[PDB]
Amino acid sequence: PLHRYPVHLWQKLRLRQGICARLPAHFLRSLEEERTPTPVHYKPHGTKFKINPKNGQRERVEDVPIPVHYPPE
Amino acid sequence: IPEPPKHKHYPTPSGWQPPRDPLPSLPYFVRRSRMHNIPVYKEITHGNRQMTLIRKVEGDIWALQKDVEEFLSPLLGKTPITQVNEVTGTLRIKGYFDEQLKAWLLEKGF
Amino acid sequence: GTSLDLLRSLPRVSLANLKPSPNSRKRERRPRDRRRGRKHSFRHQYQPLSLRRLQYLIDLGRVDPTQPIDLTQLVNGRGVTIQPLKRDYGVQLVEEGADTFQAKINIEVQLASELAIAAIEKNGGVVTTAFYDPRSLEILCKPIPFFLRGQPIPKRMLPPESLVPYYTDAKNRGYLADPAKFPEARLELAMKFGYVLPDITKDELFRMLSARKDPRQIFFGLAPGWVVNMADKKILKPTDENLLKYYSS
Amino acid sequence: VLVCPPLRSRAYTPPSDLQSRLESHIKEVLGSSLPNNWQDISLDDGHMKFRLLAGLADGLGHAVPNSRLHQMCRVRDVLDFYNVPVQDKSKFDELVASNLPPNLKISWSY
Amino acid sequence: DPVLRKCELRIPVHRRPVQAWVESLRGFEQERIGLAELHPDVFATAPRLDIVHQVAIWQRNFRRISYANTKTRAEVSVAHGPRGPTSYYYMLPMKVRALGLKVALTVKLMQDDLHIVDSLELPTADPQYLTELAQYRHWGSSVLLVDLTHEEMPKNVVAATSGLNSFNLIPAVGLNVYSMLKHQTLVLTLPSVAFLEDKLLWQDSRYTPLYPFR
Amino acid sequence: VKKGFRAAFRFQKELERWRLLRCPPPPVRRSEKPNWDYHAEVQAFGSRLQETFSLDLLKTAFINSCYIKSEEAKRQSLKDNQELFEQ
Amino acid sequence: TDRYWRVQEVLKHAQHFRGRKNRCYRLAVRAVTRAF
Amino acid sequence: FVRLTLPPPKVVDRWNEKRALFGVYDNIGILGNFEKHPKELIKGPVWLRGWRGNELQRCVRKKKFVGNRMFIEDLHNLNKRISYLYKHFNRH
Amino acid sequence: YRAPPPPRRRPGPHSPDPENLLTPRWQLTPRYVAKQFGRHGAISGVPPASLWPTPEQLRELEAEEQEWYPSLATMQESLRLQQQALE
RNA sequence: AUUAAACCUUGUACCUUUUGCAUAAUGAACUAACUAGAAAACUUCUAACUAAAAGAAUUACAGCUAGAAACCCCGAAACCAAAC
């Protein structure tokens, strides 16, 4: 068959049921909330528009964060 | 599609003229297209064969063929080469003769 | 139709009687046996309209002569095909029918031919040109969808500096043209053909024919920044002062 | 509480006094009592057509087919339509009553 | 009192109107109560049976889905075996389908297999009466009953038709070519004919849709 | 086991053919066999010969003493051909 | 599923042959064509 | 060899509800004011309802539609099968 | 038999449940909410004031207008300079 | 053919392949089952409608829409990854 919930939703189900549900709400909120780390090695694009090469028209742009590896140390 | 508006003087400045009234009492009646135009289309097949097709043929198709053959025989110089699709009620003629046929159809009052 | 007399005599048809038309299906070759055994974007894509077609549209009554010619009405009448995917940017006019199109009516076209302008003006028609943003024009052709989205009417855009000279040109009769030159310009066009210029003011419906929207205004009927109560068949106008400042901005 | 009436045959033979029944029907249905050129009278009137056709069908016992219904524009068509006999006899039934020769044997096993 | 019906739309002058006998199901002998007119452009179209043939094939084959599958040698832990679920759905032009439906109506009318009725209401709900009435009027073994809308169809007719396999009760929107051919004779209410005529007649002057009909 | 009914039906005919060949049935008179009408055959018999026969007399000639006994035996649970035979 | 009848068609013409030819379809078929 | 026994007799009813009601509402779009397109009446696998394509297209569409819900074993097998299919059609 | 009731599309606004995980994100966006308003207008219940840009949005919108969309006077200046350069 | 099973008369096994030739050469104890051509971009043909066609995204100076019409099998020496 096929799983009704994708793999990423499997973790959510465990968090919502069992001992995870019994966990303190404050701790659950801390786990649930995600805050983006402050950029260090990458800066956001200065311009918000650029000329699309394919159609030759101005298009919106996106920011790609630089990959950085943080060792366990 | 709105029906054509009544005009004080026919033909219209563009040149369109509605079917003549009263309609002819011939065995075969030719109805106009949805756009109120004569159902005559110039067609070319195989890249070398020019053709003209009449679609909205009603009544006795054989009678129409005889008259069409008679009308086109002098102008063409011989009996026209035609193919009759009775099932679809359409007539196929080799060559481009829409202008003469269109004028001739107006004479009939269609 | 003697064929019908054949039908009445013939017996009732059944499901099995169905038979494919002659030559409808071709044969195929199967491998069962030995038979098969062995072995440019910057330039606006102006879309033209023939005056003979315009006469055809007018003569057939496809577009109401009383109402001034509107590009949206032409779309509603299926006069021309405009595809946003084609990235059509403009609409133009055609000189065809110059000698077989005798009529006078007010019209607005993104682009107009100099020769055609005088001919229609000679009959007494009013011709002007307005600039619609290709994105905005697509909205203009299909107003209902953005109402479904809930978007409000935006202010009409202005041409890029490349196309400003054309619209600003008095002879082009653009909305950016100086009105002061129009009385002089119309005489010059009349002089070119030599026809006696018929003053538009003389016309009883002069105000209706000469009515024009603001450059910011997309629609004659509707001012920019307006909203429509499509569910209630009513028009909603913003009452916020800041919104008026936004429209001014 | 509703009981089906017996099935009726579709076989009709022109009456010997065909005109008598026809004229009597018109004499009653039509107030003018069979006026001049009754044969050429038009049936376009809905009320008259229903009364005349229904009355004739009940009195005569033969009814105009729906496919043939529109053809009954004039009384002449009705008179001609009724005078042609209609037989329900099957082809086998006709063969049985056709002076079967001694050497020919027919048995209906259905 | 004859019930006289005329076509709501303008019939062409060069084409004469079509007519048929109006019937009622209230009584066994209530065969003829009125006269109705039918549009020639709908009920007097040309007999083009290939379109009907084409429509029938589309009807049968557009719902066809094959789920047969087999493992090839590479998939073993068949040289030419079935490969997964396959569907045969396709769409015929809706103008042809409308044209095909028009042809079918003419065939039933010209063949005296179509029976126009004022209403489907029946004095009794007994399925026997419906079969009994069909025999008296020489209807075919299979009879199709059509009503304007499903919600308002009479209970008595539903009970009679529900218990009869060869007599099927369908709404106007459910009408199709296959059922008409499958059923020997067709019974149509007067409102249904007008409803069918409007849609079929509306097919003319078909402005190509610039947006979804919804 | 191959599916289908036509193949099974064909084999049944094959079995019947072998049975008939191996064991031909005992002879039986056409009178017992179906589609026999004594009156019809006699009329055809006379016409085929292009000769006129008196049906009553012809029946007596065909009638035999042995046949009567069989019918009489069944009856227990008519003119012989001797006179015509002598002539 | 009727391959047996195809064999019978060859067999009826090859019943009078001698040796394994009369009973082998591979050989029986060839002989019948040559005989014809 | 061939059967020596008769198959069970079978009689099929052509007027059963399924056959009798087959095809009803096939004209829903034209007869329903086009509120419901006939494609909406298609019942089958989600990735091919109202859509048709070749075997490669059908498999690819299946992967996208239920890739998140597909088994790892099935997903791995599908990728391997797709690779073979891709090479054959696009190079031979 | 009697045919089943015809299938019918459910009319009227339908509000997805935000908490449900299964509901797609795009169905919970303000654009979806704006779409609901257009379909049913007042029946949707969307506040009309929310449809117009928020004051923070208003400030953002003006930024692009100045940044990307010059006014007529600015072009008129550019034309004069370009004409002078061409001259 | 024959009255007659054999005699008399006529006739250089088969598949593939070589030259369109084998008295070459391959392959076959025999029986049963299994065992190898698959795709629509365009064209012709079949129809719908037509300066328009298509149930949204396509093409159009008779086109446009739908249908139908097509391209095998078995078999290496190898190469690489991960185990044993």
Short mmCIF file of N, CA and C (backbone and C1' of nucleotides) in Angstrom, two decimals, chain E residues 69-83, chain H residues 55 81 84, chain J residues 38 74:
data_model
loop_
_atom_site.label_atom_id
_atom_site.label_comp_id
_atom_site.label_asym_id
_atom_site.label_seq_id
_atom_site.Cartn_x
_atom_site.Cartn_y
_atom_site.Cartn_z
N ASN E 69 -0.97 -6.71 -15.10
CA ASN E 69 0.47 -6.53 -15.05
C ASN E 69 1.14 -7.88 -14.86
N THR E 70 2.37 -7.99 -15.36
CA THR E 70 3.17 -9.19 -15.20
C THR E 70 4.63 -8.79 -15.07
N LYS E 71 5.41 -9.68 -14.45
CA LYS E 71 6.84 -9.44 -14.25
C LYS E 71 7.63 -10.02 -15.41
N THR E 72 8.54 -9.22 -15.96
CA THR E 72 9.44 -9.67 -17.00
C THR E 72 10.62 -10.42 -16.38
N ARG E 73 11.48 -10.97 -17.24
CA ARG E 73 12.62 -11.73 -16.74
C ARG E 73 13.52 -10.86 -15.88
N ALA E 74 13.72 -9.60 -16.27
CA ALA E 74 14.55 -8.70 -15.48
C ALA E 74 13.93 -8.42 -14.12
N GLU E 75 12.60 -8.47 -14.02
CA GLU E 75 11.90 -8.21 -12.78
C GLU E 75 11.73 -9.46 -11.92
N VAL E 76 12.18 -10.61 -12.39
CA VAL E 76 12.16 -11.83 -11.59
C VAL E 76 13.28 -11.78 -10.57
N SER E 77 12.98 -12.16 -9.33
CA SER E 77 13.97 -12.14 -8.26
C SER E 77 15.15 -13.05 -8.59
N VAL E 78 8.03 -12.62 -18.81
CA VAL E 78 7.16 -12.50 -19.98
C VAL E 78 7.81 -11.60 -21.02
N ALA E 79 7.95 -12.12 -22.24
CA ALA E 79 8.56 -11.33 -23.31
C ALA E 79 7.72 -10.10 -23.63
N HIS E 80 6.42 -10.29 -23.86
CA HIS E 80 5.48 -9.20 -24.11
C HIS E 80 4.26 -9.43 -23.21
N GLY E 81 4.36 -8.97 -21.97
CA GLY E 81 3.27 -9.09 -21.02
C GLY E 81 2.64 -7.75 -20.72
N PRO E 82 1.47 -7.76 -20.07
CA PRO E 82 0.84 -6.49 -19.68
C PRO E 82 1.74 -5.71 -18.73
N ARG E 83 1.74 -4.39 -18.89
CA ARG E 83 2.67 -3.51 -18.19
C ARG E 83 1.87 -2.48 -17.40
N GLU H 55 3.84 4.42 -21.34
CA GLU H 55 4.22 3.69 -20.14
C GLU H 55 5.23 4.49 -19.31
N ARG H 81 13.72 0.60 -12.80
CA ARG H 81 12.93 0.39 -14.01
C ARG H 81 12.90 1.64 -14.87
N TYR H 84 16.13 1.99 -16.98
CA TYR H 84 16.12 1.15 -18.17
C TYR H 84 15.18 1.69 -19.23
P A J 38 4.45 -5.26 -31.96
"O5'" A J 38 5.06 -4.52 -30.69
"C5'" A J 38 4.20 -3.98 -29.69
"C4'" A J 38 4.70 -2.65 -29.19
"C3'" A J 38 5.24 -1.72 -30.27
"O3'" A J 38 5.00 -0.36 -29.91
"C1'" A J 38 6.97 -2.23 -28.74
P C J 74 15.83 -11.67 -24.87
"O5'" C J 74 16.76 -12.97 -24.82
"C5'" C J 74 16.20 -14.27 -24.96
"C4'" C J 74 17.24 -15.27 -25.41
"C3'" C J 74 18.67 -15.00 -24.99
"O3'" C J 74 18.93 -15.36 -23.64
"C1'" C J 74 18.62 -15.62 -27.27
#
